[PDB]
């Protein structure tokens, strides 16, 4: 819930988080973004 309610006004997303949790784990779990 803390991660879900984040905004650019309060947080900055690390590059490695973006890479991992938008490329690697979603594919490994059989879920793909539009």
């Amino acid at each position: 819930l803390n991660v879900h309610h984040r905004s650019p006004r309060t947080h900055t997303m690390p590059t490695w988080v973006r890479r991992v949790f938008l490329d690697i784990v979603p594919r490994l779990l059989l879920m793909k973004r539009p």
Binding site: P8, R9, T10, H11, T12
Partner: peptide, 5 residues
């Protein structure tokens, strides 16, 4: 704080 704006 990012303080972008």
């Amino acid at each position: 704080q990012p303080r972008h704006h």
